Design a protein around this ligand. Structure first.
Ligand SMILES: NC(=O)c1ccc[n+]([C@@H]2O[C@H](COP(=O)([O-])OP(=O)(O)OC[C@H]3O[C@@H](n4cnc5c(N)ncnc54)[C@H](O)[C@@H]3O)[C@@H](O)[C@H]2O)c1
Ligand SMILES: NC(=O)c1ccc[n+]([C@@H]2O[C@H](COP(=O)([O-])OP(=O)(O)OC[C@H]3O[C@@H](n4cnc5c(N)ncnc54)[C@H](O)[C@@H]3O)[C@@H](O)[C@H]2O)c1
Ligand SMILES: Cc1cn([C@H]2C[C@H](O)[C@@H](COP(=O)(O)OP(=O)(O)O[C@H]3O[C@H](CO)[C@@H](O)[C@H](O)[C@H]3O)O2)c(=O)[nH]c1=O
Ligand SMILES: Cc1cn([C@H]2C[C@H](O)[C@@H](COP(=O)(O)OP(=O)(O)O[C@H]3O[C@H](CO)[C@@H](O)[C@H](O)[C@H]3O)O2)c(=O)[nH]c1=O
Lengths: 347, 346
């Protein structure tokens, strides 16, 4: 690795911790400093095993300029995962999204500019808004613009996706105006070990394990492009070390599936009746379909996803939450209670 | 269809002109200006018309408590408040992040709370830039050779990116919360009351002050000029007849490169064609801006009245000439500020 001392913000979260583990296991010459605020989503247990001389955990806010400047001064790269990442929380209270996603990114960019160090912005495909279902597209999803590409127009639907898109925009502006050495990645829905139980797949799995019925927003026709967090990690690493400055790369593993189909699979794999779940209040402004065309990343950086078998990936994920119930058991009640405030069983 | 509107940034250039427009053509509407009076805010821009129709409240749009107090008594918010200079955004972006994004967010929440009309005044800079006409197959008249409502966002600077970012949350607030918002992206405004840090006023007042006009590089950059008066009627049309959630582009089809604009100014002011200095070019400088305002024209019937730039510029030059006391106290400071980052090319 060309970078020997990197800072990984949000490294105590789901995707970020997976990345830190990836770096620890595949790039031993890299020292990692994780800067994480440890919000409801941050969990030290996600990093505990590897904390030591190679990985340090610094508890703080990415909006804390003084702290960021102290860390940035000793780093040669920043991989930025820190963010409020739940659409449902953003619709309930946008405040933290404004602070962390936009002001936080801005604070990091100024540090990167000050020390002139590499900067990789980790973002989402949600900045592009949503797409119609394949059955309603003239190209069945295979035509131009029927999937997201690096040229797709930004059109975020929620406080969450809009603040992320907003962060993406200043990153690009900092590149053009100040010459900041940044790259951006927008990837599809990640799934796998360590995902907070507030998220779709982990919520259904743990709900079942906890004797609670899974929850499906509306009829569950919405489509998401699933990718295993492990492939997201290798994608980010490829962009970080070989990406073209100022460029955006889309990360996806061509795994489109509707929520209903995913939930049924979970129920089936966990030996539960097909209708053993509840339809609940649909999400306001809910995005219909997400789909990523990762040709640029594949073709230009030689990256390829290894976990293309969703059924198998999901199987392993269900097994993980089953063998690690102590990891989430104490959060179940609060999470569901929070959802009860805005979600009710509809028809 | 609104009687008590809040006009943020109403003590500035475009905003104050909008206030004058409402004062003159809609005397039944009460206007409450919320302006922080930064280096760009000027009471003189409103002093003559302050009264029963117009009141000035000095404050920050990021001041949630103040905004809530005012929003509780309004039926609409026309949002002009912003840090508007690219060059200042390059020297210190902090106020841009604060006012343009946090400020807009603060206003959106107030609009959401009271469920009132919100019109976001924005810029064509959110789309990034375009190649010169000479380098386009359609010579600027072909598809994608001008900005449209479908053009993707691609801001080049802290200023344009914070504006674009604000446009994005405005739209998200419409989709997610049903906020009654509309957005407008306008090309370069010019006319009376524009701060002398801006291109046209700067050249005009420099000549009046016996100072050399300043041209970035060789002046190849293209701007689509529109008189602020046409921008005012555009915003009014959108505010009163626009469709919720829609974005409208405002432009008068007046593309000109900086060099020819400066030359016209020199000519009109009796100065030699070469009596100016080339100065340090702007980092990440946007090449060409061009607006296709077909949507606004087609759907709302808006038609620009000041399409004769030569005549518009002449009157603008005359205004700065007739109102030198309005800008003289700032000339030295503005030129001294520029000197910190710009020098004559030689
Ligand atoms: N979940 C997904 O599928 C997904 C897919 C694509 C892109 N992304 C992006 O990937 C990144 C990580 O996503 P995630 O799912 O792992 O989120 P997460 O909710 O699991 O974790 C977010 C992490 O950031 C930390 N954090 C929050 N605010 C902070 C602040 N102000 N300062 C420092 N740390 C702060 C939290 O404590 C937590 O560890 C985000 O930027 C997200 O937008 C997420
Ligand atoms: N100048 C142009 O050609 C132009 C063209 C298109 C769009 N726009 C947009 O039009 C709007 C007005 O532009 P302008 O040229 O008149 O700008 P300006 O610099 O002349 O004035 C900005 C005004 O906002 C006020 N302001 C700044 N920060 C504030 C805050 N935090 N709270 C309250 N008031 C604050 C200033 O005091 C000032 O009166 C902006 O949103 C700008 O992005 C400008
Ligand atoms: C929590 C939950 C979710 N859903 C649905 C809503 C969505 O269509 C789908 C997935 O929802 P979520 O897990 O919240 O993920 P989603 O909104 O798609 O966004 C995720 O993926 C994005 C990238 O695609 C990231 O940027 C976000 O940070 C991340 O949270 O499942 C349900 O039906 N029931 C539930 O209980
Ligand atoms: C101040 C100054 C500017 N210029 C050039 C740079 C630009 O190409 C052009 C106009 O510069 P400015 O007056 O700063 O305007 P510009 O950057 O185009 O942006 C304006 O127009 C935008 C909309 O197009 C607004 O959003 C901005 O708030 C407004 O300031 O003239 C010079 O050549 N010399 C100068 O002294």
């Amino acid at each position: 690795s060309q970078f020997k001392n990197i800072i990984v913000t949000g490294g105590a979260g789901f995707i970020g911790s997976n990345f830190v583990h990836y770096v620890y296991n595949n790039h031993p010459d890299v020292h990692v400093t994780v800067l994480d605020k440890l919000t409801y989503a941050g969990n030290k247990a996600n990093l505990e095993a590897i904390l030591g001389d190679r990985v340090e955990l610094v508890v703080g806010d990415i909006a804390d300029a003084e702290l960021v400047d102290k860390l940035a001064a000793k780093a040669d790269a920043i991989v930025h995962y820190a963010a409020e990442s739940h659409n449902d929380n953003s619709l309930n209270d946008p405040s933290p999204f404004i602070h962390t996603n936009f002001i936080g990114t801005y604070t990091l960019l100024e540090a990167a500019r000050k020390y002139d160090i590499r900067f990789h912005h980790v973002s989402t495909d949600e900045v592009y808004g949503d797409l119609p279902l394949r059955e309603d597209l003239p190209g069945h999803g295979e035509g131009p613009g029927e999937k997201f590409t690096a040229e797709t127009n930004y059109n975020p639907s929620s406080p969450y996706s809009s603040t992320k898109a907003a962060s993406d925009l200043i990153v690009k502006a900092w590149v053009r105006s100040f010459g900041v050495k940044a790259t951006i990645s927008n990837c599809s829905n990640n799934y796998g070990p360590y995902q907070h139980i507030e998220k779709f797949i982990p919520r259904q799995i743990t709900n079942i394990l906890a004797g609670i019925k899974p929850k499906l927003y509306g009829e569950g026709k919405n489509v998401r492009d699933w990718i295993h967090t492990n492939d997201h990690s290798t994608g980010v690493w490829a962009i970080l070390t070989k990406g073209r400055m100022g460029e955006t790369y889309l990360i996806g593993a061509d795994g489109e599936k509707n929520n209903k189909e995913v939930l049924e699979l979970i129920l089936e794999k966990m030996g539960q009746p097909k209708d053993a779940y509840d339809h609940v209040t649909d999400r306001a402004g809910h995005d219909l379909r997400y789909a990523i065309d990762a040709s640029k990343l594949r073709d230009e950086l030689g990256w390829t996803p290894q976990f293309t078998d969703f059924s198998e990936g999901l199987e392993e994920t269900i097994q993980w939450y089953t063998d690690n119930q102590d990891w989430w058991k104490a959060e179940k009640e609060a999470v569901e209670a929070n959802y009860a405030k805005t979600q009710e069983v509809i028809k």
